[PDB]
Amino acid sequence: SLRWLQFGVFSPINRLHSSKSEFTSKEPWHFDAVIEQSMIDFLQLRHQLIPYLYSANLITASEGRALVEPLYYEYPMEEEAYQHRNQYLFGEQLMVAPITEKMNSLLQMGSVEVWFPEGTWYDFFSGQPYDGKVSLKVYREITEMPVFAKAGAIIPLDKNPLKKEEIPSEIIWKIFPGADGEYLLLEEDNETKAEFVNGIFTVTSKKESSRKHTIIYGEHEIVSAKRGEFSIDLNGKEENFDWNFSTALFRRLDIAEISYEQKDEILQQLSLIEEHEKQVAFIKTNENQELQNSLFELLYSGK
Amino acid sequence: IRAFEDPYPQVAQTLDLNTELEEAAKFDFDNLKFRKAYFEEVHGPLEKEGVDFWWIDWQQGAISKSGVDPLWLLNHYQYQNAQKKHKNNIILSRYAGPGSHRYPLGFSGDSVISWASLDFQPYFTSTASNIGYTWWSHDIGGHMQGYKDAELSLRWLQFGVFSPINRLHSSKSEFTSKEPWHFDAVIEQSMIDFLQLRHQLIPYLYSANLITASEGRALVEPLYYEYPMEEEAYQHRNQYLFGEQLMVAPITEKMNSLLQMGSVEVWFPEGTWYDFFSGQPYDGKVSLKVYREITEMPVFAKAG
Amino acid sequence: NNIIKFDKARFTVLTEHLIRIEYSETGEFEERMTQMVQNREFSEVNFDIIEKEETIEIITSTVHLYYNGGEFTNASLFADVKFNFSVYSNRWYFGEKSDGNLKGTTRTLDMIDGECPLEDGIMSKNGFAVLADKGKVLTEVGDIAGNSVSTIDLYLFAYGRDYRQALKDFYQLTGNTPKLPRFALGNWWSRYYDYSDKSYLALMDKFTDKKVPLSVSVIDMDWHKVSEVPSRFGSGWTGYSWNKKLFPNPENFIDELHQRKLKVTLNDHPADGIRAFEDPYPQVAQTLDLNTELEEAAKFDFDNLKFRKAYFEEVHGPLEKEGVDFWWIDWQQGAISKSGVDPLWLLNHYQYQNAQKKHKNNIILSRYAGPGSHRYPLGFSGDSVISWASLDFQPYFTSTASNIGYTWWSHDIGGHMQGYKDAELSLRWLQFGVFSPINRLHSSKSEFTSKEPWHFDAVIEQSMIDFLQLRHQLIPYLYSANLITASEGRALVEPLYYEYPMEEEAYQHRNQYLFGEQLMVAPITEKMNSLLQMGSVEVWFPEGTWYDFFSGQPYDGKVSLKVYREITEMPVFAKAGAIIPLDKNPLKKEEIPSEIIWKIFPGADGEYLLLEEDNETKAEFVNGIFTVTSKKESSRKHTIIYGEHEIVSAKRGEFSIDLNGKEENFDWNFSTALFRRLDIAEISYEQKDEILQQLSLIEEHEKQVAFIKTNENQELQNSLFELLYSGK
Ligand SMILES: OC[C@@H](O)[C@H](O)[C@@H](O)CO
Ligand SMILES: OC[C@@H](O)[C@H](O)[C@@H](O)CO
């Protein structure tokens, strides 16, 4: 039910529905506290995405571009773009690889094989980095979805998803460091251009308005509730996400339903072995094949 | 007490040791002067800093010149010495044979973390009453090695709350903490609820403690103590009487994923029984498989 | 000085790490040698004593040994080591076992299919071991004298993880291993088969035709009467009388083997003694005054001086006169004797002594007879079951034996009896055998178990012939190591933990070993994966740069890496700067090589000392300069191979050559190796094509590894990973 909702949020329309059974309600509070909270978080995220969704709607209607695109629309000459049936582009800034198989109980994580095009990619939620071009098995807890953004991506989010407003009074601009980027937010009665060029972020609009703009640069909120058109130099600011190998490794070993002797040995050897190639050699000896692939994803992001 | 230790100068003077050769005060509990140095000059300064009682952690065998197990010498003499610190003081140490119940508490040590270890422990604990050793303190959730399973940790804590002592402990792993918040919101909340319940039960537990001491009745009784002529009382190894008012059937096997519930076969003696938590009723005498979510434990009370 | 008495005990501090402990009811302590101990003369060492009325403590650099008086008990006699290898296994108690012992060996592999228990050795991960001396005392000249007056006699070893020094001082205490003769280090031929003189000589000539060198010709029990023995005598198992239908002129047959430069040994089953149908019986019956009309047997009795003398002079004597060079003592009839001395120990002790009258540095072939019996090489492990499990045990069994100083185990290469046919098992076993102390092919009485290479298909036969030639190329290296065992107490075969005592991985690769000082061996002891058409073993590479000795495939240490080989290749490695001498002429019958190849592994300095019968030759590699010198001059011609290329051919005398200009790199390359492994693999052609294309196209090493990580064949992932690791 939770994986299906994760997909629905990153689908054209997010309509919860069920047949006549007393037992098939999609109410988040039908489920346990963990599932309930994750469902509520995703349902709030859908409303946060409405500006991005409404803009892409106006693009479909005016320029004949689909919100959801097969990978081969953007990468028609890459063979891997035809080999990831459930992977897609979601508007122009986001790439989605939904987890659609039950978790491996030994890992306490589900997984999907992701194709990362040439470029630097970040997990939209965690900032975990990936060097494209590569095909890589990625693992997530049942509460986390594989959604990626390129260096230079700019995504607008409604800052007030619960407040009943015909158009957002406040937009968060979420920026992924490491390249130039551009987002055009089309609305009922405006257009707003966010530009990021040699570390300069500039917002302009065809019409003035009372809208207040929040800017998040990688990890850090730089500007809260700033009105009107402006420019800010982000060259001074920390470009790096907090995501780190050591923290992620500890979490994956800690949730895994494996032997404590194996957890201890993996934590000790990956902490002690400095050379990346010898860390990979160490995980290649592990008898649990899916555990190897999970540890490999962390070592590949951390390379 | 070896030559690097803080108390060594004082012990070396007391026992006439050659300090330039770094002569150790070797463990010798057969020796009156060694024991006196151990209690007065080694434990003494640590008790003056505020140590209330001693966890004697002996795993080095049964060899002495007297032929007396050093574990028995430690438990006997340290229990006696503990009464100078505090009225009705305790130790925490392994079982030293029949009569060593005079030196509570029992400490069962380095269990492997497994469903198997949990499934043995209620039987182990009630069976110990048959040699009068009624205060076993097990590492709740298991000590070492074994496998991670948050459900196992939660079932183990349910049992510990309805055991003689509820001591959370783990080995040296970064991964084996028994903190409730180590686990997900569901497991964490249930663990917190069970830990609160242990303190709710202290009046009951403390009253039963006075009964053990004055009347020779175990807190944890095998079913056959109350029902000696009932064959079913010999066929439910993990089922027990917990004081005089409660019957416990801990769940000690992983849940059936299709039901999202664990189960145990309970024998209900003649009479009307209720689930202590839910009020679910049961007409005895019957043997019935009972099912609980991982957050719920089978504990029963009779009408009245 | 180094002797302290207290109560009824005596303590001798032989080294800072070695203490003799004795108890005596009579106040007399034992000075005589024992079956085990040959020498208690050691240089004075420093230690401290705390002696009180009722207690003594002896303190060395590595142990506190305590005695509280009275009879030795676990409470009265104990010791703490001055190490922290364990949290609480650092105490020895008299008569108690502690954990950490790395084991030693056992009498035999008779009837063992896979693993069997071993006795304790003198080596422990926790730093101490006790070696009980339960043997009889010897006379000056080495005869059994009777019971020790030291009714308890123990050696406490407290060497920590200085395993090499423990073994050195054990050899000082128990006597060094004698020198082997060079002939023992070549290939032996053996088979429990009723050869005639003609059929045996035809086989030796077939070995020559097939380019397989041999040093020893074993003749098993069918040399003597078997089925002809009248049943009133018992069986034909014991025999001292030639079957004259098979060997009508024994002395001529043995001269024929001698003319082929082969040493000859006969199987001896001693246990039924010399019975009345035997050819030597009239002479033995005269000497021992037996009742010949009642057919009184000379029953086996090695406690008896007159029996031993009759056995040596009147039974072995005539066979040795016919040309028998040395004795295969094949005892499987138990440990019972009036003296309480194991008949196997008496045989090994006395036959090894007697064998020295025949030849300088002569040998026997016999089962292990307990601590000190390394004085009577060679070891014979006996009737192993022909199985993968038995081969998988054998490397571990062999290196572990060094922990009780028994360094010359000769296993039946390819296993002895029963079990199952598998040509690949036979080939893997020979690979190990070649890199073992002794390479003796042998088999039980089956028509189907010959170890002849031509028993097998063309691929297996050629590989077997190649490995059998390699054994003879290795005799210089083996002989030099043999002189090092005899002179310095260093085993040819060492467990990894002798060199790397502090590396946990040195305890985790049971079948991996150092073979002399220049080579590290990881034999494959499991059947191949048919999908890969390769077998594999997990290898621990210590820090440093390693090369496959055969291929020059490189490995950056420290790493644990699964390595894959076709059934025709063995994992043997050498470090940067390794120098290994090879006989250039393994098939030529020379008493010492006329020509040595010097194989140099580039990338560091190195040094090798080739010890011989009447020379020492030093090879030095310092800043790209290779230099050969010798204690004595000789006609010897030296060939130098530096990495891939022959630099100097057939150069005489001492000399120095600059190799700084020459190619250091081996040809071994990723692309060639990748193609070979994909090509032999029994996998889909679509997978082979895709792997070849992607690993060629993807340039970044980490993305090549990411590509192989997606492969659904887990073992193919590991095989491709080994290549990428070597190619990083
Ligand atoms: O002091 C460390 C010990 O291993 C303890 O943690 C055990 O609980 C003793 O049984
Ligand atoms: O003499 C026949 C024996 O069976 C030998 O072949 C064995 O190798 C002895 O162990």
Question: Which CATH number belongs to the domain containing residue C230 in this structure?
Answer: 3.20.20.80
8 Å CB contact between C433 and C439: yes
B199 in a structural domain: yes
d(CA A123, CA A150): 9
The continuous run of DSSP H or E covering C283 comes out as helix C281-287
Do residue B23 and residue C50 have CB atoms under 8 angstroms apart? yes
A217 three-state secondary structure: strand
Residue of A nearest to C559 (CA): A278
CA atoms within 13 A on the CB side of C116: 19
Angstrom distance (rounded) from CA C99 to CA C376:
30
Q: B173 CB less than 6 Å from ligand 1?
A: no
Tell me what percent of chain C is helix, strand and coil, each rounded to the nearest 5: 30, 25, 50
> Which chain B residues touch A32 with a CB distance below 8 Å?
186
Query: Chain B residues with CB inside 8 Å of A255's CB?
Result: 148
Quick check: CB of B110 below 6 Å from ligand 1? yes
B26/C66 CB distance under 8 A: yes
Residue C149: alpha-carbon gap to chain centroid: 35
Cβ atoms of residues B29 and B77 within 8 Å: yes
Give the 3-state secondary structure of residue C378. Answer: coil
Number of other residues whose CB lies within 10 A of the CB of residue C240: 25
This PDB structure is determined at a resolution in Å of 1.8
Q: C141 with C1: CB under 8 angstroms?
A: no
Residues, chain C: 728
Report the length, in residues, of chain A: 303
Please give the Cα distance from A216 to A200 (Å, whole number).
Answer: 13
Give whole-number Cα distances, C500 to A53, C83, C96, C504, C526, in Å: 63, 17, 29, 9, 26
Residues 6+ apart with CB under 8 A from A217: A175, A177, A201, A234, A237, A238, A239
Amino acid at C96: E
8 Å CB contact between C581 and C554 = no
Long-range contacts of C500-508 (CB under 8 A, 24+ apart): C500/C542, C501/C161, C501/C162, C501/C163, C502/C161, C503/C540, C503/C542, C503/C558, C505/C540, C505/C558, C505/C560, C506/C540, C506/C542, C507/C125, C508/C540, C508/C560
Q: How many CB pairs under 8 A join A and C?
A: 45
Question: Does residue B280 belong to any structural domain of this protein?
Answer: no
Of A33, A34, A260, the CB nearest to B175: A260
**Do residues C153 and C133 make contact, with C-beta atoms less than 8 angstroms apart?**
yes
Interface touch A300/C706, C-beta < 8 Å: yes
Sequence-separated (6 or more) residues with CB below 8 Å from residue B237? B122, B123
Nearest CA in chain B to C96: B63
Residue B97 lies in a domain: yes
Q: Are strands C263-268 and C77-81 parallel, antiparallel or unpaired?
A: unpaired
Tokens of C160: 């920590």
**Which residues, at least 6 apart from C476, have a Cβ–Cβ distance to it below 8 Å?**
C581, C582, C583, C593, C596, C610, C612
Q: Are B182 and B287 in contact (CB under 8 A)?
A: no
The answer to whether B231 and B257 have CB atoms below 8 angstroms apart is no
Is A260 in Cβ contact with B144 (below 8 Å)?
A: yes
Nearest ligand to the C-alpha of residue C271? 2
Q: How far apart are CA B25 and CA B6, in angstroms?
A: 13
Amino acid letter, residue C487: S
Q: Based on the structure, what is the number of domains in chain B?
A: 1
Residues 6 or more apart in contact with residue B21 via CB below 8 angstroms: C48, C50, C59
One-letter amino acid for residue C79 of the chain: A
Chain A contact probe: residue of B112, B148, B254 with most A CBs at under 10 A? B148
Distance CA C184, CA C218 (A): 12
Q: Which domain holds residue B199?
A: 1-215
> Token pair of C397, please?
């069994």
Q: Which amino acid type is present at position C643?
A: G
What technique was this entry resolved by?
Answer: X-ray
C-alpha torsion sign, points C258, C263, C269, C272: positive
Nearest to C320 by CA among C345, C354, C343, C287: C354
* Residue B36 counted as domain residue: yes
Q: How far is the CA of B171 from the centre of ligand 1 (A)?
A: 7
Of C57, C68, C88, the CB nearest to B59: C88
| Cα distance between residue A100 and residue C540, in whole Å | 40
Cα–Cα distance for residue pair C361/A149, rounded to 1 Å: 78
d(CA C673, CA C682): 16
Give residue A174's identity as a one-letter amino acid code: K
| Residue B123 CA: distances (Å) to CA of A227, A274, B233, B239, C56 | 70, 49, 12, 8, 49
Residue type, B91: I
Contacts of C695 in chain A (CB under 8 A): none
Report the C-alpha gap between C598 and C630 in whole angstroms: 14
- B21: distance to nearest CA of chain C, Å? 8
Question: C315 vs C278, C310, C318, C327, C550, CA distance in Å?
Answer: 10, 7, 6, 12, 48
Which stretches within chain A are classed as H helix?
Answer: 2-9, 33-48, 50-63, 71-74, 245-255, 260-272, 276-284, 289-301
> Which positions ≥6 away from B74 have C-beta within 8 Å?
B29, B56, B58, B93, B96
Q: Yes or no: say if C243 and C196 are a contact pair by the CB < 8 Å rule.
A: no
C-alpha–C-alpha distance, residues A184 and B147, integer Å: 52
Please report, as a single letter, which amino acid is at residue B259: L
List the structure tokens of C244: 């004259």
Using alpha carbons, select from B237, B257, B232 the residue that is nearest to residue B248: B237
DSSP of C71-83, one letter per residue? S--TTTEEEEES-
Whether B233 is covered by a domain: the verdict is no
C629-664 burial code (b ≥16 CB/10 A, e <16): ebeeeeebbbbbbbbeeebbeeeeeeeebebeebeb
Location of structure tokens 């501090």? C13
Rounded to the nearest angstrom, the distance between the alpha carbon of B137 and the centre of ligand 1 is 13
- Asked if C418 contacts C446 with a C-beta cutoff of 8 angstroms, the reply is no
Nearest to A149 by CA among A247, A52, A50, A293: A52
Please choose, from the candidates B111, B117, B116, B87, the residue with its C-alpha nearest in 3D space to the C-alpha of residue B213.
Answer: B87
Residue pair C237/C478 in contact by the 8 Å Cβ criterion: no
Place of tokens 């978790």: A103
Task: Retrieve residue C434's tokens.
Answer: 């070649």
Q: C559–A296: do the CB atoms touch at under 8 Å?
A: no
- C-alpha span between C434 and C492 (Å, rounded): 13
| CA-based nearest residue to A91, from A116, A79, A76, A74 | A74
Alpha-carbon span C30 to C10, nearest angstrom: 10
Q: What is the dihedral sign for C-alpha A143, A147, A152, A155?
A: negative
What chain C residue is nearest to A276 in terms of C-alpha separation?
Answer: C702
Q: Mutual orientation of helices C714-726 and A276-284 as an angle, nearest 10°?
A: 150
Task: Quote the minimal CA–CA distance from B89 to chain C in Å.
Answer: 29
Nearest to C50 by CA among A28, A67, B26: B26
Tokens of C496: 């990894």
To 10 degrees, the CA torsion angle through B192, B194, B195, B199? 130
The SS3 assignment for C93 reads strand
Residues 6+ apart with CB under 8 A from C656: C625, C626, C627
Report long-range pairs for C149-153 (Cβ below 8 Å, ≥24 apart): C149/C24, C149/C26, C149/C28, C149/C29, C149/C30, C150/C10, C150/C22, C150/C23, C150/C24, C150/C29, C150/C30, C151/C23, C151/C24, C151/C25, C152/C21, C152/C22, C152/C23, C152/C72, C153/C20, C153/C21, C153/C22, C153/C30, C153/C34
**Among candidate residues C416, C434, C433, C419, the one with its CA nearest the CA of residue C190:** C416
Distance separating alpha carbons of residues C329 and A14, to the nearest angstrom: 87
State CA C721 to chain mean position distance. 34
Backbone angles phi, psi at C563, to 5 degrees: -115, 145
Radius of gyration of chain A (CA): 21
